[PDB]
Amino acid sequence: GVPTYLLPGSGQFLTTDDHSSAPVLPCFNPTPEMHIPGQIRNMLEMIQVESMMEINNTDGANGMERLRVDISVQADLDQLLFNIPLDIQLDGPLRNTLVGNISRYYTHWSGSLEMTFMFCGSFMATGKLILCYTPPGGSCPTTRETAMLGTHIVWDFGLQSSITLIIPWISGSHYRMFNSDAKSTNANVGYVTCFMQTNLIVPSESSDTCSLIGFIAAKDDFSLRLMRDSPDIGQSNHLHGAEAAYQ
Amino acid sequence: GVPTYLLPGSGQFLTTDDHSSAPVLPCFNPTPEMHIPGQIRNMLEMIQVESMMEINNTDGANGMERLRVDISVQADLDQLLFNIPLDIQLDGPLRNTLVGNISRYYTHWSGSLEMTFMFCGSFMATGKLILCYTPPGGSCPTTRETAMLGTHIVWDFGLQSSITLIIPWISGSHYRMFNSDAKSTNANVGYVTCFMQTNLIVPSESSDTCSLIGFIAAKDDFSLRLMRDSPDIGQSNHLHGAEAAYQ
Amino acid sequence: GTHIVWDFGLQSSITLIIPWISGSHYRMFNSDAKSTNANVGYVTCFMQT
Amino acid sequence: SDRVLQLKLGNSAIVTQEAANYCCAYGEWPNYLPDHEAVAIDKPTQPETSTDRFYTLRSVKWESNSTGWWWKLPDALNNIGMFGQNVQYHYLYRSGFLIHVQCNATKFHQGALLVVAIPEHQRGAHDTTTSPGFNDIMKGERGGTFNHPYVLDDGTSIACATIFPHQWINLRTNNSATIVLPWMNVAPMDFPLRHNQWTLAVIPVVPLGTRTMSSVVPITVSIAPMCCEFNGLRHAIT
Amino acid sequence: SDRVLQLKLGNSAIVTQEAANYCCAYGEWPNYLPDHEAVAIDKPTQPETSTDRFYTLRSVKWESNSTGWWWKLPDALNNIGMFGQNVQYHYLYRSGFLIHVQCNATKFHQGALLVVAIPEHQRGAHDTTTSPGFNDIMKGERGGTFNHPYVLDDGTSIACATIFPHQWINLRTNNSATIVLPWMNVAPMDFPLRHNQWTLAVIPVVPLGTRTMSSVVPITVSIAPMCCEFNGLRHAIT
Amino acid sequence: VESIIKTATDTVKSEINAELGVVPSLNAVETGATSNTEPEEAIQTRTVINQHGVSETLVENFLGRAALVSKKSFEYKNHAHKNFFKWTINTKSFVQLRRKLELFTYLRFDAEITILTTVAVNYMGLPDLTLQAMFVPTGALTPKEQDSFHWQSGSNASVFFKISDPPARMTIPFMCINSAYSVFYDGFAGFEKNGLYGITIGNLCVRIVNEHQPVGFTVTVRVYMKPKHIKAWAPRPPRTMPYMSIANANYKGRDTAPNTLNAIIGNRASVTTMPHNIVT
Amino acid sequence: VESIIKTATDTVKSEINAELGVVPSLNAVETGATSNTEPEEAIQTRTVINQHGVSETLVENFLGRAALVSKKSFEYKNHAHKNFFKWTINTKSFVQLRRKLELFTYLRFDAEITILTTVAVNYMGLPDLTLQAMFVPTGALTPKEQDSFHWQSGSNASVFFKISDPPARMTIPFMCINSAYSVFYDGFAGFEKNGLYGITIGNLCVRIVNEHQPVGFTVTVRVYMKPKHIKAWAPRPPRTMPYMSIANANYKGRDTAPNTLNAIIGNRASVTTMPHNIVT
Amino acid sequence: INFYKDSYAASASKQDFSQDPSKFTEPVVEGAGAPVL
Amino acid sequence: INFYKDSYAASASKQDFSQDPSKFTEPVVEGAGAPVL
Ligand SMILES: Cc1cc(CCCOc2c(C)cc(-c3noc(C(F)(F)F)n3)cc2C)on1
Ligand SMILES: Cc1cc(CCCOc2c(C)cc(-c3noc(C(F)(F)F)n3)cc2C)on1
């Protein structure tokens, strides 16, 4: 016979191993493949679709009220409207999104993100906003004069209902990490803030309070590494009927 | 030597595995092969032979009386003569047939079935019947007006003694399943009913009650998958002599 | 039946074609409105929204 | 020029002067079942124009406190016109769908509806271990409404519903949404009375609002089956 | 033209004007033992015409309550004519069989007989653990009858007996059945006195009936060995 | 006639038919032939390219499964079955395997044998005993004691295995004196009339080679057989009545349907009664 | 449209832009299309040859991990679950696997099954027991007792393994009657209205083949599943509300955020409050 | 393949796809839709 | 590669690098920086 010797690791069961194994049903003929719409081959395809950010995650906002940011006709100038924590690891407006949910099944990420805001006020409503992305380093800016110094886009409400703010991949390291420490230099992405560029102006018969819906997605330069179990799902007891499966 | 490592599954005994094994009697010379009539290579060959359906599975019908359906000269029109439950998994007229018995050794099936009825009345006896196959969805039809709307064949008694009702494979899924739930959408095949198209007419010296024998078989477009133990045979104790084999 | 859903907008007008759907080559102007060789059918208008 | 659109099927046609282009679910387009994908061997019936046409369901009223509406296909149409007849007389069916949701208001109105076609939208019941019943699921032409649109009544989230074929009706932008759905199933055909391939959901993510004259703002759904095929003819399961 | 048939072997011939084509067991046809399949080295005797001919056994009466009849081959013929003589004088034999079961009645009679040739029909006893005895099995020319035809007296079923070479005699259709049986065994030859290759079973699945003049309706069996060969000559085991 | 079939046959589209003298749906059961009516001739069909495989029904696979053929438990202790047993080999003791084999008249195949052993105390731990399974062919002498000379197995084939090792396994070649095994035998075993009707491989002798321990254990040996390189002839009507003996096909039937000598299929109210009728 | 992507797309240097009629950063969400604004069009970029691989997000790998699908512990002793259990197979009992599978509408894959066994005394040592896992497909008879005939497994597939051997393992082919498994089913199981809404593979029956010992033990069997040769269709919104039943998608939500039916994301003081703001 | 010297020790033979149903379904001597009689 | 006779027993298939995001990101019929309306 062939002389052999067993190596460490012999007999172990690694959940991520990759080997062939005995076919339970020999000569089994699987059902012929048929074409089905929507085949996905790489999870990156899925995270490239924009989904809604729960920007209004505040007490008093229930259900879908949390998905829209309401802005109203201001009395003062250069007003700050809202900011968005860019925490994907720590619970935040970006966590329950396609890109957020899937990324949380990994530990490392790299690539540009994109935020798209759709103005849902009346047609007679006008305004200009400024969306700013601030690379990490300091405190989140609270004035337009400061925010304006980062990556930004000035948005003019009009026929095209939506604007896009690219959050370009600006990092020292090839990848960032989903650290449980939000202030870590390998995790913090910076901030996104939104100010009135001018103001929201509407006529008497239009609602003087309008909503914005923010979406986010990954671009095709995105990459995810080191798979892990998502912190978004857990179990304390048996699910109903789980035990009755043995009866 | 060669460095190796054992994988999970090592040392197990899978009843369906397929490997070579040590020959007990080395240099043994098996008896030369001889030609023998009736070689069968695929079980599908066997189920293509029609066998008798126990259509008259009722109390009062003993033995072979259960294999023939008696029809008599009617007094009313469009009379329902009998129906056939198409249960192959649940005990029914089709269970103890070649196609039925062998199919029950599997879990999935696909293909057209065929039912052939042979009229065994006297030569002087005439009549026309209508055999209907009703795809699933509702209740088994009880009137010819309704049954007539499905797949059917109008049979005229004559020199050719037998008629064939094709139960074409009409399913959404590639295969059907032998579910213990007869009303399952992946199991129910529909119904077969038989009505008088006209009537059974015979002269004074002929028996006014005649029998039909129904047969069923699979066509060559049939396919069976996922082998399992047949529910048709069991054991509670040792068979007589089984223990004496150790004495 | 045969229909068209009309959305009010820059184009002010909509057109409903009443296609020639008859058994006979021609219809007739019978003094009997319910005659099978005269009745053309109906045109009705509902709010879509 | 992608704000204007006309759809014509059979004896029906629809135009819109404020569209937002239109969606082709998963970039596909309806088509008849090819021989190399077929299973049922009986020759099918392809009604064409008598079934492949627009059917308009009863409208719903968009209110300030509305939670959203849904219609399951083909259930919503299983009892309408010749489509419904074929469905009742055949064991198997197959078809794509051209969906056109319409809703207009005023340039003084605001509101945004997410119009999404959800494949296999299996509903869940709220705060109970008992699975939804037949009447909870089969609403027919009337359709149903969402109890908790926030999680699409299935424990997930409307936020990520955009992963499904969809469009929006944002009052200041457009007044209609159009989605072309191809056959979506793991089988080439199916039994129309006990399984719904798609679910049309229209949810007001941004509530209807205005300060002008108040008036009833309806939402109307028109659906046109496409490339219909039917197999397994028998009596009607009315 | 397949309702008419004449069989001719040796000095015997049979015709039928109401046949139903005829069966060739497993699509085979009798033939002599080829050199490359032979085992016994002594030169065999091939009697031909003196053994390969039709032998008609005593008839049986088909009654209203009959359960069926059976004849085992070669036992049924082991004591008839030159075939029987060769069988008694030789240790080994080999042959095919041409079976012709005949039964006629009136166009006012009804009844259906399953005529099946069962290979290795090993009988079973009813409600006892004791195996069938010699006299239960070896009936000779007279043959035996079924106790429980429903299960072919072996715990299986007559319903599936059609898996074996067979034909039917349905009174309104035909009056005879013909089955050609090739040599059926795991050995090129065998000892004729202790093993039966085939069993001819004639079972009335549909009882004999009529309302006309009652008369005795017989069933007759004629069997013709084919391509007979005998080896191992010695004295006769009468 | 003969041909290679790898998938279910396709279906061709068929048109309307109204031909005189052509009646495909009519047949004659009396001929002994099965109806040859094609679906295309009974109804209007569409074209279907059928890709369903037919591998799982290959005889090689249908019978190609390891099945229990023998199970014996005995006491391993000081007997002052004495620490070993002798089994007269047969394939008629367990119904699952038996019924499948009996679906054929003749079978030619090599047999893969697998031996599984388990032990239980009559608790201080389970001993990893060594066993010896010896194949004693017809006519050879069978062991008289746990340690008789027979076990030196000079010519018989023996396999020694430990309880801690994977089940023992070897292949028994097709060993009939004929071209195939007779699953059924309509004949007698001897030249005299008192012989046995119906239905010899030999004896499988298994012993524990270890001397007895201070305490007793129950040892159970399960033998499995898997036929391979299979050739089968003349399919048969499946068994319906429960089995009674390993020596014959005697039958009695269940006390109540199904499978009672009186009725194989359970009863339904009448021939017009649909058992699991859909009540919509 | 379709193409082979092995690495993240590169970035091209972009210049200053001031073109009339060209507004790449403006989009229309109503179309249902995701913003197609490229980084190069939103800001001035440099050239970057991106070599980041995209292998780990391949569906084959994302789902290609062995996950616990079943866990059952029972008492192995003299029962005078009787030394064996029957599990109606399902993939909805453990949330980690369930949630990932539910990220798709349809899935086609072969399943690698691994069975891990452990035992504990109820101390004199741990017995190296032999177990038998038998796959009883839909419609087949399930074992009634630790030693009923069903276990002779003449056709069912069974695997015998010892506790001292590496976990047992075999591959279950993609076995749906359709081209793919329906992770979600918006329909009913039967033709009647009383049927079950939503959501049959069969039963996995596991027993200890050894007879009982003089003392009792607790035996736990863990079954893991790893899909391979995967094809997936129609991605879905991830589950957020805790699961309630294996039979449905019923929801209730946590008592307090996060993941309460009322608010999926935990609250922050206001929309202008930065939660982990850097206080330099 | 097979490392044992005896060929009967080899693994299963699952490649015999030939078949002739007719020997069981049409064992009649005289072979469309014409009357079988 | 694979020593079992059934191909479904083989190890994982990690080489399908093709993809078409557009079926999810741009399912619109009418395909730069020009107004999408
Ligand atoms: C009829 C019929 C006859 C057969 C042959 C069955 C052969 O199986 C036996 C044989 C011959 C040997 C062993 C056997 N067990 O162990 C050994 C060893 F010791 F030689 F390895 N041989 C076990 C069985 C069941 O199959 N059908
Ligand atoms: C929906 C859906 C359905 C599936 C199929 C899961 C199949 O897994 C089962 C099966 C069929 C067999 C075993 C199994 N365990 O042991 C055996 C053996 F005995 F056959 F080896 N089979 C275990 C599970 C969980 O995946 N998603």
Swiss-Prot record, chains A, B:
Give compartment(s): Virion; Host cytoplasm
Signal peptide span: none
**Transmembrane spans:** none
Record: residues binding N-acetylneuraminate: 91, 95, 231-233
Assembly and interaction partners: Interacts with capsid protein VP0 and capsid protein VP1 to form heterotrimeric protomers. Five protomers subsequently associate to form pentamers which serve as building blocks for the capsid. Interacts with capsid protein VP4 in the mature capsid. Interacts with protein 2C; this interaction may be important for virion morphogenesis. Interacts with host IRF7.
Q: What does this protein do?
A: Forms an icosahedral capsid of pseudo T=3 symmetry with capsid proteins VP2 and VP3. The capsid is 300 Angstroms in diameter, composed of 60 copies of each capsid protein and enclosing the viral positive strand RNA genome. Capsid protein VP3, together with VP1, interacts with host cell sialic acids to provide virion attachment to target host cells. In addition, inhibits the phosphorylation and nuclear translocation of host IRF7 and thereby suppresses downstream interferon production.
Q: What is this protein called?
A: Capsid protein VP3
Range covered out of full length: 318 to 564 of 2188
